[PDB]
Amino acid sequence: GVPTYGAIILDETLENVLLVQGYLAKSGWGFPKGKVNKEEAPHDCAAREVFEETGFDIKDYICKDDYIELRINDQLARLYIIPGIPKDTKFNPKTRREIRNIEWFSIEKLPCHRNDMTPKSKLGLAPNKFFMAIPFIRPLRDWLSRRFG
Ligand SMILES: c1cnc(NC2CCCCCC2)nc1
């Protein structure tokens, strides 16, 4: 898999995160991110994908050591952590063939796992519109605890 890069954008209170909603296969809510081009540095891909999907330029705010990285089915995803962006910021995708909506969500209300179906004696997981964000939620809460208490 080609690595992906993007951002976890938080507001000034540290309560809220910015998610984006795609279409079709990407029809739920997730962090803004995308696949690296040939020769492109990680920090540059993260600002490019985030600017295409949100209209906000993170390049002046990226810190090189502040990120959460996960490997999911043998594809690496790294999201740079960007705190203190005001909730009244105007966000506007470039690409509205790709992005349906852009919204702030309360971190403490987001799920950090999907629910099973053990009430129906059935295997697997119930559908959840946050499926693409979910793997990052617990590592983000632990990172914010360590760095801010
Ligand atoms: C995990 C997987 N995917 C995504 N975002 C994708 C990229 C386009 C933006 C709409 C959401 C879909 N985030 C985290």
UniProtKB/Swiss-Prot annotation:
Motif interval(s): Nudix box: 34-55
PTM comment, free text: Phosphorylated at ser-249 in a MTOR-dependent manner.
Consequence when changing residue 52 to Q: Loss of decapping activity
Binding sites annotated in the UniProt record for Mn(2+): 49, 53
Cellular localization per UniProt: Cytoplasm, P-body; Nucleus
Tissue: Expressed in brain and testis. Not detected in heart (at protein level).
The Nudix hydrolase domain, residue ranges: 1-131
Family of the protein in this entry: Belongs to the Nudix hydrolase family. DCP2 subfamily.
Subunit structure: Found in a mRNA decay complex with LSM1, LSM3, LSM4, EXOSC2, EXOSC4, EXOSC10, PARN, XRN1, CNOT6, UPF1, UPF2 and UPF3B. Forms a complex with DCP1A, EDC3, DDX6 and EDC4/HEDLS, within this complex directly interacts with EDC4/HEDLS. Interacts with DPC1B. Interacts (via N-terminus and C-terminus) with TRIM21 (via N-terminus and C-terminus). Associates with polysomes. Interacts with LIMD1, WTIP and AJUBA. Interacts with DDX17 in an RNA-dependent manner. Interacts with ZC3HAV1. Interacts with APOBEC3G in an RNA-dependent manner. Interacts with ZFP36L1 (via N-terminus). Interacts with NBDY.
Function: Decapping metalloenzyme that catalyzes the cleavage of the cap structure on mRNAs. Removes the 7-methyl guanine cap structure from mRNA molecules, yielding a 5'-phosphorylated mRNA fragment and 7m-GDP. Necessary for the degradation of mRNAs, both in normal mRNA turnover and in nonsense-mediated mRNA decay. Plays a role in replication-dependent histone mRNA degradation. Has higher activity towards mRNAs that lack a poly(A) tail. Has no activity towards a cap structure lacking an RNA moiety.
Name of the protein in its database record: m7GpppN-mRNA hydrolase
Encoding gene (name): DCP2
